[PDB]
């Protein structure tokens, strides 16, 4: 994070321990759930890569997926050298041009990143690009760890349909499939993977039903 | 949210972690009680849409209801477009009168959301309008989740009358009936749906009894 | 069918008796299967609606699916009536411009159908339009009749993967699903709903195996 100073200049201001601690608890309590990506972004909002790295480095308990997150980040950096035509050399006394690794933080400091994040001639984000690389790694972890998949989400006679619907959408959310497939899944697979009593009730509800009407209708099973 | 610096300038700020955390707990622990609507407003009071979405996108349980809220928001934006003239050809370089998904903030950036909130030409307060759309979705869920209903709420023979009242009013609230219906229900259905022993006493109090008088007299029956 | 003779003089002929019979048998035996849609066309190519109406009528055993086809023809004709309305008072020496019902062949005579089909001003092949309207009705029936759905198709333990994929694919076509959904099911639902022994053998293939490679690999499994 950075604090502006009189004259239009900026200085580094450290990230809060509570924010770092809150990130670790979200990772452990939710076990790399799908909600570990968005909460992280808010906790890491207006931050540089240097501070973001600390949070990721603070945890050593789960390093199987933090290692996967690392692979994707350097992959984006490897791709970054071509995505951005190499700028070439500039005179001495001027800031260096940012590369893939500078975005990751394996090499650069918070001040160089602060100067890049607040450069009047060529302002460049180094932490929005990096957090995105981390988030792409975080999402792969969610899908790899997801316990039961959408096709296997099913309702038992005892299970109330509502409960089965929450599990189905949570899994559908963990996956990032095309919306069209989701529509076929949310209108067909949902009625299909139900207890047969309420499935017949959903046939009574009609064709092209809505979630409010499906939930209101099977209120009792 | 929004932070205004000297000179009339406006900037975006992160949303505090505890506010996100408190919103998450209220949604899950209260199982979408009727206080998850106001609990959302206070925590989101004076914030930008970009940070709201996050709060709603940091919760992984009761996800089916979150899908209902998403649909309601889309519909409000549809009506907004119908009631807001597409300005059409506009001076290029003029902040675009925000459209439907520019109030929700999905198709727009936080800065222009802040710029519309205080736009000198025609400020569009994106924040209050979007929170209201979400609130309507939250309110539908409270009703759908509500376990029982006012008509079926009935004092147990051995159950005390006051407990029946706590159950009755909580539902006269969860079911958001018009105030006139509320007066009629409170003046009558709290006596009709009661057990006979206390009902006679409530009739003995006199016509238009008041709740203080009804609770005091039926105390210990 | 129709038959030009001299001076471009088109005339009417009888529809072959073994063509009416073949349509009946294709329908009675394939039970309105998917191939009924094209088999109909090959047996009705160049036939006017009148003769097509005789073929469909000769089938008297199945009359619920034929009604579904009939309900659809009425609609298509009502969209050709609204969008192509009565021209008005046609000048002397003109024939009423073809309407949707004339395309159906219920009102217009075979001669009038031929006059429009070869009309120098309105050469509208009434036959191919009615044939197209019928296909849609036949296709709804195929989807409505198909015995086993894709989610309900699962390989038998004593059955091969190739036999199961054939039952699975036949169904995908009867369901007539969107192409994006088709790819997901074909690359996934064909493995999830497979004998566990061959499912693991479809994992050693790699990622996105092709059907050519999926079968050869599970050959004897």
Curated annotation (Swiss-Prot), chains A, B, C:
Residues of the full protein shown: 136 to 356 of 1464
Protein task: Forms the conical core that encapsulates the genomic RNA-nucleocapsid complex in the virion. Most core are conical, with only 7% tubular. The core is constituted by capsid protein hexamer subunits. The core is disassembled soon after virion entry. Host restriction factors such as TRIM5-alpha or TRIMCyp bind retroviral capsids and cause premature capsid disassembly, leading to blocks in reverse transcription. Capsid restriction by TRIM5 is one of the factors which restricts HIV-1 to the human species. Host PIN1 apparently facilitates the virion uncoating.
Interaction with human PPIA/CYPA and NUP153 as annotated region, ranges: 57-94
Region called Dimerization/Multimerization of capsid protein p24, residue ranges: 145-221
Lineage: Viruses, Riboviria, Pararnavirae, Artverviricota, Revtraviricetes
Subunit relationships: Homodimer; the homodimer further multimerizes as homohexamers or homopentamers. Interacts with human PPIA/CYPA. Interacts with human NUP153. Interacts with host PDZD8; this interaction stabilizes the capsid. Interacts with monkey TRIM5; this interaction destabilizes the capsid.
Protein location: Virion
Domain of life (superkingdom): Viruses
Site (Cis/trans isomerization of proline peptide bond): 88-89
Protein name: Capsid protein p24
């Amino acid at each position: 994070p950075v604090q502006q100073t009189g004259g239009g200049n900026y200085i580094h201001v450290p990230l809060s321990p509570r924010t770092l601690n809150a990130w670790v608890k979200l990772v452990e309590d939710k076990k790399f759930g799908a909600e570990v990506v968005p909460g992280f972004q808010a906790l890491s909002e207006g931050c540089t890569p240097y501070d973001i790295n600390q949070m990721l480095n603070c945890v050593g308990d789960h390093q199987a997926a933090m290692q996967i997150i690392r692979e994707i980040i350097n992959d984006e950096a490897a791709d970054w050298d071509a995505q951005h035509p190499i700028p070439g050399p500039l005179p001495a006394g001027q800031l260096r041009d940012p590369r893939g690794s500078d975005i990751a933080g394996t090499t650069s400091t918070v001040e160089e990143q602060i100067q890049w994040m607040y450069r009047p001639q060529n302002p460049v984000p180094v932490g929005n690009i990096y957090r995105r690389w981390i988030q792409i790694g975080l999402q792969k972890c969610v899908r790899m760890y997801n316990p039961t998949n959408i096709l296997d989400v099913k309702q038992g006679p005892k299970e109330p349909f509502q409960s089965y619907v929450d599990r189905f959408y949570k899994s559908l959310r963990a996956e990032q499939t095309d919306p069209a497939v989701k529509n076929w899944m949310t209108q067909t697979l949902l009625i299909q993977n139900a207890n047969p009593d309420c499935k017949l009730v959903l046939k009574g509800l009609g064709m092209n039903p809505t979630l409010e009407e499906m939930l209101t209708a099977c209120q009792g099973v």
